Amino acid sequence: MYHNSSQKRHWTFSSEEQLARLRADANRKFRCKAVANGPNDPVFLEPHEEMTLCKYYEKRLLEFCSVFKPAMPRSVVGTACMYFKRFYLNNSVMEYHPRIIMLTCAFLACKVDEFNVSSPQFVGNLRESPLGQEKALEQILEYELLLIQQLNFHLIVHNPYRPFEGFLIDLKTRYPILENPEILRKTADDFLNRIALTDAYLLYTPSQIALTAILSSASRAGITMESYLSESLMLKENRTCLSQLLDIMKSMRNLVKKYEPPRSEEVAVLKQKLERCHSAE
Amino acid sequence: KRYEKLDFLGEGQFATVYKARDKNTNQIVAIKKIKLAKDGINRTALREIKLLQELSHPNIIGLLDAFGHKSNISLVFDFMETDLEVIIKDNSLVLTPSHIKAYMLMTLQGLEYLHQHWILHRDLKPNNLLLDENGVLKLADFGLAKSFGSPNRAYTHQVVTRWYRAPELLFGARMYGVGVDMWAVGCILAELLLRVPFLPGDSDLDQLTRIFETLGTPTEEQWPDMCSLPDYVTFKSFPGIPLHHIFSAAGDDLLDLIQGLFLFNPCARITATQALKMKYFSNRPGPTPGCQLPRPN
Amino acid sequence: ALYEYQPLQIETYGPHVPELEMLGRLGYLNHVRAASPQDLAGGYTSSLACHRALQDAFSGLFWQP
Ligand SMILES: CC(C)c1cnn2c(NCc3ccccc3)cc(NC[C@H]3CCNC[C@@H]3O)nc12
């Protein structure tokens, strides 16, 4: 349950600039280590370039999990993407290659969410030569404990998907002003897919994320839902909680608007620098 | 790696367990070092890691730390001196009604918390009810424990040790809830009272025979939809033995608890919450303090 | 030194979740899939799935880090 989770306790941060510090520190430690290993050398990635590669490899994780046979449930994909985010919070993309950690994240997520895929079924989803699938499997298993150590052994991930279903039940039963809340579902799922690309999953509760997605679908539909917040969720009695909640949903929507995708020609250069840094690791 | 290995505490399928001293504090801990090809880290270890990181209750085993090397992970726990199986089998210990009340109370508290966090222990038996030196019972061995309440997942039915396995699992339920742990608490309570395995069936069909012979063959009035279960086979109509002829020393309060735990219908079978609210716990005598629970020495 | 049951107070930092036996009489169960006879026979009731969904929805709704 989220309200006493390791996720709440350790992996939900106060601001986007706290995340920036963690990542800047991880980038810095790789440089500091590599220079102590034999200092402002252009072979290194800057933290914003690591961020672009993390955004790019998040997207490839999404596509890997999308095409995955047998069909990978949405909570495994969400758990994998959360691990990928959490790994590269305290770790450099220059130390551990995101293409391997992407797959290790997916592989660990399959195990943690009881999606009992066999290792041969797993690496059979890599569009690679079978020698490369077996090589990729060795790397996946080699990095697996490293992932778990870098997650601080906090393996359960609370995704917005189940809270989203809970709000869609609650809307139907308690909020008859919104007749047919399932009109919100597609456009709320669209927002949920957008907010997953941002740092929101490290900043907000999965209930806040799910509510934001629902209310943003409703505002996009011309439906006011302030009466759901005030009357149904009882926030008429605690205006100081209504304010906080509306602030959270506002900041989360602004955090989607300020999202810029990893640009294809930017990434094409950063991948070569990433590869050069891995060749000269 | 802050852990000096004292003693060897046991081996099982996935792990060897050792008593260790934590050098950083001089706490005695049990390190469960996981044993091993091309599957990576063992799922039973990851199941125990993932679930016990999210639970914090006096009567559930604390995962104090975890660490490892290349696919050989090791999990550090609270050191427990004994289990309820050792108490049950130790013919020198008297299990008074207050001792049985205390053991049941702590089990149901741990199980209430666990069920409130939507986890089934799914392997409850006297081995897995460990006792610390202060006489606090903890649920342990989370190797089969699973999150429940999600329809989008099927669960296996071969997932409590046979003698503590609920009739819905023996009839092959792939969807179930707290009834699979609450039956096993029944079986443990029965074994606390009798000092012997209550329903010691040799096979799954023999387990069903033992259950129905003891508690009566369920009617479709007792357990609606029973016939729908995948591995349902009809049995001879056993009358069952009245619970006061089984539990000759049980008061009517305790018999109501036992009866609620042993209802065939897993929906009607009492939850840990409603078990704890029963007059059995509220009545005299009080449950013994942990410091006064019988210590197999 | 007798037991008395205490309701197991844990802070969910979000709105009140309606209790498991209230779910049908408050109309929540109209809006989830019914438990199949197999699921019912095993002890899954869809009050379980409903209640879990409602508990997740409200879990930390009012919490900020
Ligand atoms: C891993 C952790 C949960 C743990 C803590 N103390 N402890 C002890 N202590 C000694 C002991 C001896 C006899 C009976 C019970 C306990 C033994 C032990 N053995 C491993 C399994 C065996 C089956 N019962 C559950 C145990 O965890 N596991 C543990």
XYZ file of C-alpha atoms and ligand atoms in Angstrom:
672
model
C 0.000 0.000 0.000
C 1.440 3.392 -1.059
C 0.873 5.321 2.213
C 3.554 3.258 4.034
C 5.605 2.204 1.005
C 9.345 2.403 0.408
C 8.303 4.462 -2.650
C 6.709 7.151 -0.460
C 9.434 6.951 2.207
C 12.533 7.059 -0.076
C 11.689 7.604 -3.777
C 9.216 10.503 -3.792
C 11.269 13.738 -3.725
C 10.406 17.335 -2.744
C 11.222 19.025 -6.089
C 12.554 18.638 -9.630
C 15.743 20.497 -8.546
C 16.413 17.876 -5.820
C 16.368 15.281 -8.656
C 18.708 17.531 -10.656
C 21.178 17.558 -7.711
C 21.151 13.721 -7.430
C 21.818 13.387 -11.167
C 24.446 16.193 -11.209
C 26.172 14.468 -8.270
C 26.065 11.082 -10.113
C 27.597 12.684 -13.252
C 30.227 14.418 -11.084
C 31.156 11.177 -9.248
C 31.750 9.354 -12.556
C 34.099 12.159 -13.719
C 35.789 12.356 -10.278
C 36.227 8.550 -10.325
C 37.424 8.402 -13.979
C 40.009 11.162 -13.306
C 41.150 9.423 -10.060
C 41.361 6.280 -12.287
C 43.708 8.283 -14.646
C 39.514 16.396 -15.916
C 37.024 18.578 -17.930
C 37.523 16.312 -20.957
C 34.829 16.494 -23.787
C 34.569 12.649 -23.757
C 32.316 13.046 -20.679
C 28.571 13.713 -20.908
C 27.126 16.742 -19.082
C 24.091 16.021 -16.769
C 21.590 17.401 -19.337
C 23.069 15.089 -22.003
C 22.673 12.138 -19.629
C 19.070 13.359 -19.160
C 18.453 13.292 -22.950
C 19.855 9.729 -23.152
C 17.741 8.691 -20.125
C 14.665 10.165 -21.922
C 15.643 8.337 -25.113
C 16.235 5.013 -23.324
C 12.972 5.400 -21.319
C 11.261 5.558 -24.715
C 13.098 2.433 -25.988
C 12.127 0.653 -22.750
C 8.503 1.632 -23.505
C 8.854 0.204 -27.050
C 10.593 -3.014 -25.817
C 7.783 -3.567 -23.302
C 5.166 -2.631 -25.989
C 6.225 -5.348 -28.482
C 7.094 -7.927 -25.745
C 5.650 -11.468 -26.246
C 3.876 -12.733 -24.112
C 1.980 -9.413 -23.679
C 3.623 -7.585 -20.765
C 1.062 -6.152 -18.251
C 1.016 -2.341 -17.760
C 2.270 -2.626 -14.128
C 5.445 -4.445 -15.315
C 6.104 -1.681 -17.861
C 5.473 0.942 -15.168
C 7.724 -0.916 -12.668
C 10.509 -1.234 -15.300
C 10.303 2.486 -16.218
C 10.324 3.446 -12.531
C 13.481 1.327 -12.025
C 15.117 2.954 -15.026
C 14.343 6.411 -13.561
C 15.465 5.404 -10.051
C 18.712 3.809 -11.292
C 19.808 6.872 -13.292
C 18.986 9.136 -10.395
C 22.159 8.132 -8.466
C 24.052 6.543 -11.386
C 25.765 7.855 -14.473
C 24.752 6.803 -17.969
C 28.555 6.876 -18.608
C 29.225 4.108 -16.050
C 26.394 1.693 -16.851
C 25.117 1.663 -20.394
C 21.377 2.475 -20.530
C 20.690 -0.155 -23.238
C 21.694 -2.912 -20.800
C 20.074 -1.301 -17.735
C 16.837 -0.823 -19.790
C 16.707 -4.623 -20.247
C 17.816 -5.371 -16.671
C 14.998 -3.047 -15.461
C 12.466 -4.913 -17.613
C 13.851 -8.301 -16.512
C 13.763 -7.401 -12.796
C 10.251 -5.897 -13.222
C 8.985 -9.157 -14.808
C 10.277 -11.057 -11.753
C 9.057 -8.527 -9.138
C 5.503 -8.282 -10.594
C 5.154 -12.103 -10.873
C 5.040 -12.022 -14.685
C 6.698 -15.414 -14.967
C 8.636 -15.110 -18.206
C 11.583 -17.507 -18.664
C 15.018 -15.996 -19.569
C 14.843 -17.522 -23.132
C 11.329 -15.997 -23.621
C 12.759 -12.697 -22.304
C 15.812 -12.320 -24.574
C 13.799 -13.812 -27.493
C 12.151 -10.317 -27.578
C 15.494 -8.690 -28.492
C 15.646 -8.060 -32.296
C 19.208 -9.470 -32.297
C 21.173 -12.487 -33.546
C 20.778 -15.438 -31.045
C 24.472 -15.087 -30.014
C 23.674 -11.420 -29.221
C 20.543 -12.536 -27.292
C 22.719 -14.893 -25.193
C 25.381 -12.131 -24.818
C 22.589 -9.709 -23.810
C 21.297 -12.290 -21.288
C 24.780 -12.521 -19.681
C 24.839 -8.719 -19.348
C 21.232 -8.672 -18.023
C 22.146 -11.186 -15.252
C 25.501 -9.487 -14.594
C 23.737 -6.123 -13.980
C 20.717 -7.570 -12.053
C 22.143 -7.385 -8.506
C 23.603 -3.955 -9.368
C 20.085 -2.759 -10.228
C 18.677 -4.158 -6.933
C 21.520 -2.516 -4.938
C 20.932 0.812 -6.743
C 17.181 0.561 -6.020
C 18.244 0.123 -2.338
C 16.318 -3.191 -2.448
C 13.026 -1.183 -2.755
C 11.383 -3.258 -5.464
C 7.622 -2.635 -5.116
C 6.464 0.203 -7.367
C 3.093 1.891 -7.019
C 1.917 2.978 -10.425
C -1.008 5.353 -11.121
C -2.948 2.609 -13.006
C -4.796 1.014 -10.064
C -5.614 4.404 -8.383
C -6.900 5.471 -11.796
C -9.360 2.509 -11.824
C -10.336 3.381 -8.223
C -11.197 6.978 -9.171
C -13.097 5.716 -12.235
C -15.167 3.494 -9.869
C -15.622 6.383 -7.362
C -16.724 8.846 -10.101
C -19.447 6.438 -11.291
C -20.857 5.710 -7.845
C -20.478 9.098 -6.044
C -20.327 11.766 -8.807
C -23.424 11.448 -11.089
C -22.871 15.002 -12.455
C -20.264 13.303 -14.694
C -22.555 10.845 -16.452
C -20.326 8.219 -18.164
C -16.807 8.942 -16.696
C -15.457 6.280 -19.137
C -15.424 9.089 -21.764
C -12.492 10.439 -19.695
C -10.557 7.126 -19.866
C -8.796 7.400 -23.266
C -7.708 11.034 -22.827
C -6.760 10.403 -19.167
C -4.621 7.411 -20.295
C -3.010 9.772 -22.879
C -2.118 12.203 -20.058
C -0.898 9.257 -17.919
C 1.443 8.194 -20.754
C 2.692 11.831 -21.034
C 3.284 12.315 -17.290
C 5.268 9.012 -17.211
C 7.886 10.660 -19.519
C 8.489 13.435 -16.964
C 9.906 13.220 -13.407
C 6.344 13.175 -11.933
C 6.604 9.530 -10.794
C 9.489 10.612 -8.492
C 7.680 13.783 -7.290
C 3.999 12.959 -6.750
C 1.965 10.119 -5.324
C 0.422 7.666 -7.858
C -3.032 8.809 -6.567
C -2.142 12.477 -7.306
C -0.883 11.420 -10.750
C -4.080 9.414 -11.429
C -6.320 12.275 -10.212
C -4.418 14.868 -12.311
C -4.875 12.642 -15.379
C -8.622 12.295 -14.738
C -9.210 16.007 -14.020
C -7.081 17.048 -17.043
C -9.213 14.754 -19.235
C -12.314 16.398 -17.706
C -11.005 19.958 -18.219
C -10.072 18.950 -21.814
C -13.739 17.773 -22.149
C -15.161 21.072 -20.773
C -16.309 19.214 -17.582
C -15.771 20.976 -14.231
C -14.918 18.546 -11.403
C -14.285 20.983 -8.510
C -17.466 19.609 -6.865
C -15.905 16.122 -6.987
C -12.896 17.472 -5.073
C -14.856 19.660 -2.628
C -18.065 17.675 -2.004
C -17.253 14.025 -2.843
C -13.598 13.990 -1.630
C -14.772 16.167 1.369
C -12.236 18.974 0.636
C -15.023 21.523 1.401
C -14.111 20.917 5.104
C -10.329 21.378 4.583
C -9.720 24.187 2.047
C -6.003 24.086 3.017
C -5.952 20.531 1.599
C -7.991 21.576 -1.510
C -5.365 24.281 -2.172
C -2.428 21.804 -1.813
C -4.160 19.306 -4.088
C -4.968 21.904 -6.779
C -1.333 23.177 -6.513
C 0.003 19.594 -6.978
C -2.219 19.037 -10.037
C -1.236 22.460 -11.423
C 2.519 21.827 -10.893
C 2.162 18.347 -12.420
C 0.411 19.754 -15.529
C 3.155 22.431 -15.834
C 5.736 19.650 -15.484
C 4.131 18.008 -18.588
C 4.077 21.347 -20.502
C 7.791 21.991 -19.806
C 8.658 18.452 -21.069
C 10.746 18.473 -24.260
C 11.330 15.066 -25.984
C 14.862 13.725 -26.727
C 15.559 15.249 -30.183
C 16.642 12.675 -32.844
C 19.727 14.593 -34.082
C 20.697 15.543 -30.489
C 20.454 11.867 -29.423
C 22.363 10.663 -32.536
C 25.390 12.695 -31.344
C 24.969 11.894 -27.621
C 24.842 8.137 -28.356
C 28.247 8.372 -30.105
C 29.659 10.199 -27.067
C 28.032 7.549 -24.818
C 29.563 4.763 -26.939
C 32.978 6.552 -26.980
C 32.780 6.856 -23.164
C 31.938 3.092 -22.973
C 34.763 2.128 -25.371
C 37.162 4.231 -23.249
C 35.477 3.211 -19.900
C 29.507 -7.958 4.753
C 29.240 -6.380 8.326
C 28.191 -9.846 9.578
C 30.311 -12.347 11.524
C 28.855 -15.868 11.050
C 28.129 -17.583 14.395
C 26.046 -20.770 13.892
C 24.204 -22.658 11.129
C 20.418 -22.518 11.681
C 19.061 -24.625 8.821
C 18.957 -25.317 5.099
C 15.955 -25.411 2.765
C 15.443 -25.570 -1.034
C 16.471 -21.975 -1.843
C 18.662 -20.989 1.120
C 20.946 -21.774 4.015
C 20.344 -19.761 7.215
C 23.049 -18.756 9.704
C 23.076 -16.932 12.982
C 25.390 -13.918 12.658
C 26.531 -10.981 14.711
C 26.058 -7.583 13.093
C 29.515 -6.043 13.844
C 28.116 -2.479 13.488
C 25.801 -2.906 16.543
C 26.359 -6.426 18.103
C 22.835 -7.540 17.213
C 22.235 -11.234 16.583
C 20.610 -11.637 13.182
C 19.704 -14.594 10.982
C 21.323 -14.285 7.544
C 19.466 -16.293 4.917
C 22.035 -16.825 2.159
C 20.347 -17.822 -1.075
C 21.652 -20.826 -3.048
C 21.797 -21.511 -6.782
C 21.538 -21.122 -13.977
C 20.698 -18.382 -16.596
C 17.509 -17.294 -14.686
C 19.371 -14.708 -12.547
C 18.454 -14.054 -8.911
C 15.992 -16.553 -7.399
C 12.346 -15.371 -7.367
C 11.759 -16.760 -3.839
C 14.479 -14.404 -2.561
C 13.018 -11.491 -4.564
C 9.505 -12.298 -3.293
C 10.770 -12.168 0.274
C 12.775 -8.960 -0.425
C 9.964 -7.126 -2.256
C 7.215 -7.934 0.289
C 9.181 -7.557 3.537
C 10.487 -4.120 2.488
C 6.867 -2.875 2.494
C 5.709 -4.396 5.807
C 6.524 -3.221 9.315
C 4.575 -4.931 12.089
C 5.687 -6.524 15.441
C 4.352 -9.923 14.318
C 5.929 -10.028 10.861
C 9.643 -10.822 10.408
C 11.748 -7.702 9.812
C 14.096 -7.803 6.842
C 16.888 -5.806 8.497
C 19.252 -5.639 5.485
C 19.987 -7.399 2.178
C 23.184 -7.630 0.091
C 24.947 -10.120 -2.214
C 27.364 -10.980 -5.037
C 26.729 -12.105 -8.702
C 23.224 -13.732 -8.485
C 23.876 -14.939 -4.861
C 21.879 -12.527 -2.701
C 21.546 -12.773 1.114
C 18.764 -11.428 3.351
C 19.295 -10.415 7.006
C 16.484 -10.932 9.505
C 15.618 -10.610 13.159
C 17.021 -13.715 14.881
C 14.197 -15.891 16.220
C 15.113 -18.538 18.808
C 12.320 -21.053 18.077
C 9.104 -21.712 16.127
C 5.626 -22.801 17.073
C 6.323 -26.332 15.704
C 9.027 -26.788 18.379
C 6.553 -25.544 21.061
C 3.810 -27.892 19.744
C 6.142 -30.932 19.571
C 7.893 -30.265 22.936
C 5.966 -32.694 25.190
C 7.578 -30.997 28.255
C 5.708 -27.690 27.547
C 2.114 -27.217 28.697
C 0.100 -25.114 26.214
C -2.380 -23.525 28.618
C -5.489 -21.779 27.185
C -3.741 -18.384 27.756
C -0.656 -19.587 25.794
C -2.881 -20.691 22.919
C -4.713 -17.334 23.176
C -1.390 -15.412 23.028
C -0.058 -17.406 20.034
C -3.377 -17.009 18.197
C -3.614 -13.311 19.026
C -0.105 -12.535 17.690
C -0.687 -14.655 14.574
C -3.991 -12.900 13.798
C -2.480 -9.454 14.442
C 0.372 -10.195 12.006
C -2.142 -11.676 9.571
C -4.604 -8.736 9.985
C -1.832 -6.299 9.108
C -0.667 -8.505 6.228
C -4.206 -8.879 4.843
C -4.864 -5.105 5.247
C -1.770 -4.555 3.016
C -3.341 -6.962 0.524
C -0.762 -9.766 0.967
C -1.559 -13.450 1.529
C 1.140 -15.314 3.496
C 0.081 -18.423 1.611
C 2.329 -20.813 3.580
C 1.093 -20.504 7.168
C 2.125 -23.509 9.337
C 3.813 -23.882 12.800
C 7.384 -23.771 11.250
C 6.698 -20.347 9.763
C 5.515 -18.881 13.076
C 8.857 -18.014 14.616
C 9.209 -16.859 18.260
C 11.862 -14.381 19.404
C 13.487 -14.565 22.867
C 10.903 -12.027 24.180
C 8.063 -14.372 23.090
C 6.823 -12.224 20.183
C 5.537 -14.507 17.433
C 6.367 -13.375 13.897
C 5.158 -14.628 10.571
C 8.202 -15.670 8.476
C 9.014 -17.429 5.166
C 7.473 -14.988 2.664
C 8.717 -17.171 -0.197
C 5.141 -18.001 -1.401
C 3.470 -14.771 -0.154
C 1.553 -12.893 -2.852
C -0.465 -9.700 -3.289
C -4.196 -10.503 -3.638
C -7.342 -8.595 -4.675
C -6.273 -8.203 -8.327
C -8.487 -10.240 -10.762
C -5.951 -9.699 -13.608
C -3.591 -12.301 -12.043
C -4.235 -16.018 -11.567
C -2.674 -17.601 -8.486
C -1.553 -21.264 -8.133
C -3.539 -23.692 -5.901
C -0.516 -25.810 -4.775
C 0.470 -23.191 -2.212
C 0.095 -24.053 1.403
C 1.677 -27.184 2.959
C -1.024 -29.839 2.448
C -2.048 -30.263 6.102
C -2.867 -26.549 6.444
C -4.300 -26.214 2.933
C -7.883 -24.912 2.711
C -10.467 -26.998 0.811
C -10.787 -24.352 -1.942
C -7.063 -24.829 -2.746
C -7.432 -28.643 -2.668
C -10.441 -28.221 -4.980
C -8.152 -26.103 -7.179
C -9.112 -22.408 -6.584
C -6.913 -20.114 -8.718
C -8.658 -16.989 -7.262
C -8.992 -16.774 -3.487
C -8.434 -14.368 -0.634
C -7.706 -14.387 3.087
C -9.531 -17.733 3.591
C -6.350 -19.643 2.542
C -4.457 -18.114 5.511
C -7.436 -18.136 7.892
C -7.983 -21.899 7.379
C -4.296 -22.493 8.114
C -4.674 -20.498 11.386
C -7.566 -22.918 12.111
C -5.200 -25.873 11.451
C -2.483 -24.258 13.645
C -5.027 -23.549 16.437
C -6.238 -27.147 16.190
C -2.613 -28.339 16.355
C -1.954 -26.029 19.396
C -4.960 -27.699 21.097
C -4.314 -31.323 20.032
C -0.458 -31.126 19.934
C -0.632 -33.200 16.734
C -1.318 -32.225 13.050
C -5.078 -31.813 12.817
C -5.627 -32.957 9.229
C -2.432 -34.930 8.273
C -3.436 -36.147 4.777
C -0.891 -38.169 2.763
C -2.124 -36.761 -0.603
C -4.457 -33.931 -1.796
C -7.417 -36.365 -2.101
C -6.528 -37.865 1.290
C -6.393 -34.276 2.653
C -9.945 -33.684 1.346
C -11.015 -37.038 2.861
C -9.411 -36.086 6.230
C -11.089 -32.620 6.189
C -14.577 -33.896 5.270
C -14.320 -36.905 7.608
C -13.480 -34.544 10.495
C -15.653 -31.455 9.767
C -18.422 -32.954 7.584
C -18.796 -33.000 3.808
C -19.926 -29.458 2.792
C -23.357 -28.993 1.263
C -23.985 -26.451 -1.546
C -25.988 -24.607 1.207
C -22.846 -24.296 3.370
C -20.571 -23.534 0.400
C -22.444 -22.183 -2.648
C -20.563 -22.501 -5.954
C -18.205 -25.216 -4.485
C -19.000 -27.453 -7.488
C -17.530 -24.775 -9.839
C -13.949 -25.272 -8.517
C -11.593 -26.824 -11.197
C -10.566 -29.911 -9.202
C -13.926 -30.435 -7.474
C -14.780 -34.096 -7.067
C -17.780 -35.164 -5.013
C -17.129 -37.031 -1.757
C -19.081 -39.459 0.401
C -21.389 -37.677 2.890
C -19.407 -37.724 6.146
C -21.399 -36.317 9.131
C -18.272 -34.753 10.686
C -17.392 -34.961 14.374
C -18.870 -32.134 16.579
C -16.036 -29.713 17.503
C -16.524 -30.284 21.277
C -15.762 -34.002 20.677
C -12.563 -32.977 18.848
C -11.554 -30.079 21.135
C -12.722 -31.613 24.425
C -11.050 -28.867 26.506
C -12.289 -25.932 24.337
C -14.779 -23.442 25.816
C -17.782 -22.372 23.683
C -15.991 -19.077 22.833
C -12.973 -21.025 21.488
C -15.302 -23.400 19.621
C -16.932 -20.340 17.942
C -13.432 -19.157 16.899
C -12.506 -22.661 15.634
C -15.866 -22.983 13.828
C -15.458 -19.540 12.187
C -11.901 -20.479 11.028
C -13.122 -23.819 9.605
C -16.139 -22.682 7.566
C -16.002 -24.338 4.165
C -17.229 -21.234 2.339
C -14.079 -19.043 2.079
C -16.295 -15.907 1.911
C -18.094 -16.850 5.175
C -14.884 -18.020 6.909
C -13.791 -15.365 9.386
C -11.159 -12.727 8.544
C -8.275 -11.954 10.956
C -10.034 -8.710 11.957
C -13.326 -10.437 12.818
C -11.420 -13.312 14.490
C -9.706 -10.714 16.751
C -13.101 -9.142 17.585
C -14.500 -12.537 18.748
C -15.311 -12.979 22.438
C -12.572 -15.628 22.707
C -9.899 -12.897 22.798
C -11.984 -10.487 24.931
C -12.866 -13.148 27.586
C -10.894 -14.456 30.525
C -8.241 -15.715 30.886
C -6.088 -12.948 29.348
C -3.467 -13.946 26.674
C -0.091 -14.497 28.404
C 2.657 -11.837 28.115
C 5.464 -12.812 25.674
C 7.846 -12.976 28.683
C 5.637 -15.786 30.140
C 5.071 -17.854 26.955
C 6.619 -21.391 27.275
C 10.255 -21.544 26.166
C 11.434 -24.899 24.636
C 14.916 -25.152 26.247
C -4.890 -8.070 31.253
C -7.511 -9.101 28.633
C -7.400 -8.306 24.910
C -9.598 -5.630 23.437
C -9.497 -5.234 19.669
C -8.078 -1.876 18.463
C -8.961 -1.097 14.735
C -5.272 -0.998 13.406
C -4.892 2.757 12.776
C -2.535 3.489 9.859
C -2.626 6.915 8.197
C -3.801 6.832 4.632
C -3.132 10.453 3.660
C -6.240 10.772 1.520
C -10.040 10.569 1.671
C -12.079 8.021 3.657
C -12.391 4.691 1.860
C -15.892 3.147 2.374
C -15.647 -0.139 4.291
C -15.703 -3.543 2.493
C -19.292 -4.538 3.514
C -20.679 -1.072 2.629
C -19.485 -1.277 -1.016
C -22.605 -3.021 -2.375
C -25.178 -1.004 -0.347
C -23.366 2.201 -1.466
C -23.474 1.117 -5.166
C -19.698 0.708 -5.852
C -20.145 -2.907 -6.949
C -22.296 -1.884 -9.959
C -19.101 -0.385 -11.425
C -16.727 -3.379 -11.172
C -16.938 -6.814 -12.854
C -18.736 -9.436 -10.718
C -16.801 -12.358 -9.243
C -17.397 -15.531 -11.298
C -18.792 -18.643 -9.433
C -15.216 -20.104 -9.471
C -13.885 -16.930 -7.877
C -16.764 -16.825 -5.360
C -16.188 -20.498 -4.474
C -12.525 -19.621 -3.792
C -13.338 -16.491 -1.697
C -12.717 -13.711 -4.265
C -15.819 -11.433 -4.225
C -14.987 -8.306 -6.359
C -15.654 -6.329 -3.198
C -11.938 -7.212 -2.865
C -10.983 -5.658 -6.218
C -13.286 -2.690 -5.677
C -11.922 -2.035 -2.172
C -8.306 -2.393 -3.280
C -8.877 0.052 -6.196
C -10.578 2.571 -3.833
C -7.775 2.156 -1.266
C -5.103 2.818 -3.929
C -7.045 5.835 -5.323
C -7.134 7.485 -1.912
C -3.825 6.150 -0.459
C -1.555 9.239 -0.353
C -3.799 11.748 -2.242
C -3.192 14.488 0.364
C 0.499 13.740 1.012
C 3.397 15.948 -0.125
C 7.100 14.970 0.276
C 15.447 -16.448 8.242
C 14.720 -15.960 9.484
C 13.245 -15.805 9.230
C 15.031 -16.745 10.734
C 15.267 -16.220 11.990
N 15.571 -17.078 12.924
N 15.567 -18.261 12.278
C 15.896 -19.483 12.777
N 16.298 -19.600 14.105
C 16.542 -20.860 14.778
C 15.311 -21.748 14.898
C 15.492 -23.067 15.284
C 14.405 -23.913 15.410
C 13.134 -23.451 15.135
C 12.944 -22.139 14.767
C 14.016 -21.279 14.682
C 15.829 -20.561 11.917
C 15.394 -20.352 10.639
N 15.340 -21.422 9.766
C 14.886 -21.310 8.378
C 13.379 -21.526 8.144
C 12.980 -22.982 8.443
C 11.469 -23.215 8.385
N 10.769 -22.218 9.321
C 10.995 -20.775 8.860
C 12.494 -20.510 8.923
O 12.776 -19.213 8.484
N 15.068 -19.154 10.152
C 15.195 -18.121 10.953
